[PDB]
Amino acid sequence: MIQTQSMLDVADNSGARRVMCIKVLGGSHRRYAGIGDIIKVTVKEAIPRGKVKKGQVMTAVVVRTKHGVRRTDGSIIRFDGNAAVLLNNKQEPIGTRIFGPVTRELRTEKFMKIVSLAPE
Template structure:
């Protein structure tokens, strides 16, 4: 994964319910694990904006419910700090389902709502279809 320019506070833990921000027929998902997390024994894995997580679909199309997929976190409620001193926070926690782990190709074709700039830095494929980058 590429580095990002902000110091992102990890505000999403295992078990957090995320809104799916793309049109991949899933509506809600639950974080199962954080990809690449190296932490301390018996501590919940945490993730922030632009991190890749593994999610289980809990609401949406019946063919997708219960499936485990990879996703990238696009928004989080917990505020984080950018290098210029600004603090950024969103009104919900959201993710984007991806098909390919290496390139970050999204499963959907449209992304609803804003996407953090840090996501576009790390995953340029998501930035190509994002309508609002904050």
């Protein structure tokens, strides 16, 4: 989410209900990860029947956080509750629908799917 061992729920239908960050991908030692940054998570609490089992190492992208996202302005979108979206071995999402809002700072060439699938 923003640090190793940071509990957060997922924004996905076929995923779990809560996951925990275990590694912030990127440089040598990244202390923090903002919205739109890849993390590595472990499934801590799963839905009674989905697709991802409990206690599995997956890759996720941060989509919401209480720290907020800062644009090229004095204006920041700040949520109340963290969230993430799971990813496959390739960097495309697992589920179909996305719960809650997202941010337009996230949409890049590689994330045109989840932004289109999410109600902002």
